[PDB]
Amino acid sequence: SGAIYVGNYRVVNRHLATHNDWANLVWEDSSRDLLVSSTTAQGCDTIARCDCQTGVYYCSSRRKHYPVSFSKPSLIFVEASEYYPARYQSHLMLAVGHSEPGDCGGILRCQHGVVGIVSTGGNGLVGFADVRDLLWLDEE
Numbered sequence: 001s002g003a004i005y006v007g008n009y010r011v012v013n014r015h016l017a018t019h020n021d022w023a024n025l026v027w028e029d030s031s032r033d034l035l036v037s038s039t040t041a042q043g044c045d046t047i048a049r050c051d052c053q054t055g056v057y058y059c060s061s062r063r064k065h066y067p068v069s070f071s072k073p074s075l076i077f078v079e080a081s082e083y084y085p086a087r088y089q090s091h092l093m094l095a096v097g098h099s100e101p102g103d104c105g106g107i108l109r110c111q112h113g114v115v116g117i118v119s120t121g122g123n124g125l126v127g128f129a130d131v132r133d134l135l136w137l138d139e140e
């Protein structure tokens with residue numbers, strides 16, 4: 001679990017969105033595994049606007065933050081799960097790191113701010129849904 005709290009937005013994995021998120025919906029995209037809802041309180045996270053390929057992510061199944069090198073956002077085949085059929089997910093970045101299904105939502109960050117959230121993983125792989133192209137998260 002986990003979310004990004006930037007301005008009056010809450011960014012979560014679409015597959016973990018709550019009823020309150022759907023009832024306060026701003027934007028969602030199944031192909032990216034992202035959903036954004038509106039918040040009453042202002043958040044403290046800031047979004048990175050850069051092309052970093054190194055950063056640090058939070059892994060809840062280890063209670064640890066790990067440094068990682070990650071691929072550029074791209075269209076990656078993701079195996080079938082209880083949340084989606086096997087399909088191509090867009091704007092996904094892969095890295096070597098520990099992950100389990102419940103680690104989705106953990107933040108990936110670089111020197112410029114939040115880069116994305118954990119969205120997939122494998123045997124020693126972790127994948128992150130990028131948010132750096134979502135420029136509207138910085139305003140309204």
Ligand SMILES: CCNC(=O)c1cccc(NC(=O)N2CCC[C@H](C(N)=O)C2)c1
Nearest residue numbers: 033081083099100101119120121122123
């Ligand atoms: C080969 C064994 N797999 C793992 O150890 C493992 C390790 C970490 C995660 C996963 N599951 C995973 O990526 N998703 C489940 C939730 C929905 C995600 C999506 N965005 O479509 C995809 C499997």
Ligand SMILES: [Zn+2]
Nearest residue numbers: 050052110112
């Ligand atoms: Zn950066």
